[PDB]
């Protein structure tokens, strides 16, 4: 039906937003790891 097609379209849109939210997560995980590398190189390495 046309209703079932519209529903499947709505479902895939919601699924795509879920993936966009996970993409945002990955972007911030890169930043968190980079901040750990920075802290190590800017503070622990010289102390030792």
């Amino acid at each position: 039906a046309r209703s079932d097609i519209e529903k499947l379209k709505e479902a895939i849109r919601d699924t795509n937003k879920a993936v966009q939210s996970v993409q945002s997560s990955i972007g911030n995980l890169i930043v968190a790891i980079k901040s750990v590398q920075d802290y190590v190189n800017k503070e622990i390495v010289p102390s030792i």
Partner: protein
Amino acid sequence: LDPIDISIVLNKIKSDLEESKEWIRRSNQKLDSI
């Protein structure tokens, strides 16, 4: 040395993760309608 604190970025990731979970619930709700 002063302590590392990445709690702010980790909170952002947790927030994005929670938002992702709701969109998946919404997708499955729509499929439940078929």
